[PDB]
Design a binder for this molecule. Sequence first.
Ligand SMILES: CCCCCCCCCCCCCCCCCCCC(=O)O[C@H](COC(=O)CCCCCCCCCCCCCC)COP(=O)(O)OCCN
Ligand SMILES: CCCCCCCCCCCCCCCCCCCC(=O)O[C@H](COC(=O)CCCCCCCCCCCCCC)COP(=O)(O)OCCN
Ligand SMILES: [Ca+2]
Ligand SMILES: [Ca+2]
Ligand SMILES: [Ca+2]
Ligand SMILES: [Ca+2]
Ligand SMILES: [Ca+2]
Ligand SMILES: [Ca+2]
Ligand SMILES: [Ca+2]
Lengths: 150, 52, 369
Amino acid sequence: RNLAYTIGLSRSNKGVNPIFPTYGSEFSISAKVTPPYSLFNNINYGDLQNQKEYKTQYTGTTTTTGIDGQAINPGDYTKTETVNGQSGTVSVGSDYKSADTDVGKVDQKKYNWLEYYKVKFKADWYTKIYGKLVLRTLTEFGFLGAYDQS
Amino acid sequence: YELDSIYGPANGKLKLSVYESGYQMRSSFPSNGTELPQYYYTSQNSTFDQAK
Amino acid sequence: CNKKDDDEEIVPLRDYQEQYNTDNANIEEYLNTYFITVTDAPGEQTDQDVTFTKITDPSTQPSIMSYLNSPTFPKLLKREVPMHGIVYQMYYLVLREGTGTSPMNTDGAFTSYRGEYLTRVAKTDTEAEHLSTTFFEQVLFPTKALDLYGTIIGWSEAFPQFKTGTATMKPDGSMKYENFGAGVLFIPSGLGYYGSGASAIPAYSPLIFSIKLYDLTRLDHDLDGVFDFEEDINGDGYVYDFRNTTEYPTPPANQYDDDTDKDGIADFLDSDDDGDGYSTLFEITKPTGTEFLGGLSKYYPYNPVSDNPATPNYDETEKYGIPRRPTGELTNPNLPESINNPRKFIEDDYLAAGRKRIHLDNTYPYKKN
Ligand SMILES: CCCCCCCCCCCCCCCCCCCC(=O)O[C@H](COC(=O)CCCCCCCCCCCCCC)COP(=O)(O)OCCN
Ligand SMILES: CCCCCCCCCCCCCCCCCCCC(=O)O[C@H](COC(=O)CCCCCCCCCCCCCC)COP(=O)(O)OCCN
Ligand SMILES: [Ca+2]
Ligand SMILES: [Ca+2]
Ligand SMILES: [Ca+2]
Ligand SMILES: [Ca+2]
Ligand SMILES: [Ca+2]
Ligand SMILES: [Ca+2]
Ligand SMILES: [Ca+2]
């Protein structure tokens, strides 16, 4: 979900034909900002990968066998191991610290509410050099960032 | 044409003899509960030469 | 034209009960009006060949049916085969019983057979109605063992009642077989090819097979390290899986006989075999550093094995079998037996008779922390 506010200031004095301008310039500055959710909500986005809720686990209710040939009881944490050529998940027991971090859950929590800021700057200038020949200079900038690097 | 994979002098001659084999050959044989493969070695010339 | 219609009129699928009654009547009539002659070549390939001929002198011609549950060979027996809802009855004659082991209903059989199909011929104007047997397939010199699991139901049911014989290789490469089981099995159409008729055998045609069991090959269908003959819970000698609704519309009361976990999958086709989660292969795998290796293999055999003289480049001596629950001393006298402090194997755990092998016990591998 994304909730943003955008404000832009532009100054254009080009003329006379929009298709082939012969004089003037156009300067535009924009800034799209989202609420800083990271500041108010007390959540550590850096330690998410080191928590039980963000570790791979077996949600089934029937005992199964992993790639290692061992039992995988319901509710036990899992880890990925490559036995021979094929690779698969191997039960780690209740030691969630040794399990694999669920990147999908971490990314979901990190990107559940989009938090960013976008700044765009553009400058266009038109001038007549000789006769009907006109020179156009264009400079564009774009910056996308986040309030919290974590 | 020119023959390929010929080892030795080009003027060599050999006495070729084509006989009807009298030794039955098999690809596999049952064993004590298992189906083992049949192997024929390079030193079994006497067995095939006597049973012609 | 351009259209592709799907009009399959093989929907008839004659009733299993009606077809069985017709086949049984035809087979019974054949057994009453015909007699068999058996050759007696001791070591030749025609040791126990059978020839069927019509009975025209019933005074001194004993019909096949005459060999009822007789106390001396040849003996014609009946085996009840419950399948397709109805109860099939298959007649099989045992001319001679082998002097070896008997293959399971899902094992490989090395044998030579000559098959023929029975078909009642309509009574013509000049010729009266009778029964005719037409030849379709024959293998006089077996080369590869046939898996009884994929064969017709008749073979998988009658073969476990015969025994193998000794085989000796002659100096000219030929093999001589002796003291092997031989007999003729009359399998109805339902237990053979029911409605297929693709091959030379017409659809709904009872089959008559003359078999000679030379040898057998133990097979493992689940690749769990335990062969099908060792995964038979009862001593019946047959292993069945009731997960096919076509063959078994309703699971019979005899289910769970060859299924320890009662999961619906028989042990001969199940990997876990006990429901503990740990696969049978892992449980029977020899652990690292164990003091009871007893062989060069990485998997514990079901029972102790000996080397194979036929294999001179490999020693198959395995003096230890699949162990039972550890009945030794704990790693530490204190604390209760668990994954932390496991019990050590004494020695008798790999050789005791009647022990519950860890692959059939859901409490040995221990719970993970
Ligand atoms: C970059 C984003 C941030 C932009 C922030 C915008 C700020 C808004 C400013 C509002 C205007 C000021 C309020 C009073 C207006 C009345 C005029 C008197 C102000 C003044 O002294 O300046 C006049 C012109 O400059 C002015 O009026 C002030 C100039 C304001 C800055 C100009 C640049 C804006 C940003 C755009 C540049 C980037 C390109 C993207 C479009 C010159 O008056 P005078 O000739 O009498 O001299 C004065 C001596 N008595
Ligand atoms: C920084 C981004 C993230 C934070 C969000 C910032 C939000 C800024 C505030 C919201 C914008 C609304 C308020 C300014 C506009 C009201 C002006 C009314 C219209 C008008 O006539 O303009 C006159 C001056 O305009 C002016 O006000 C001139 C200046 C207007 C532009 C200044 C706003 C920032 C521009 C830069 C945006 C890009 C940022 C890049 C980093 C005021 O006249 P009057 O109404 O009194 O009547 C008297 C004569 N008509
Ligand atoms: Ca098995
Ligand atoms: Ca059984
Ligand atoms: Ca099972
Ligand atoms: Ca099994
Ligand atoms: Ca198991
Ligand atoms: Ca050996
Ligand atoms: Ca077990």
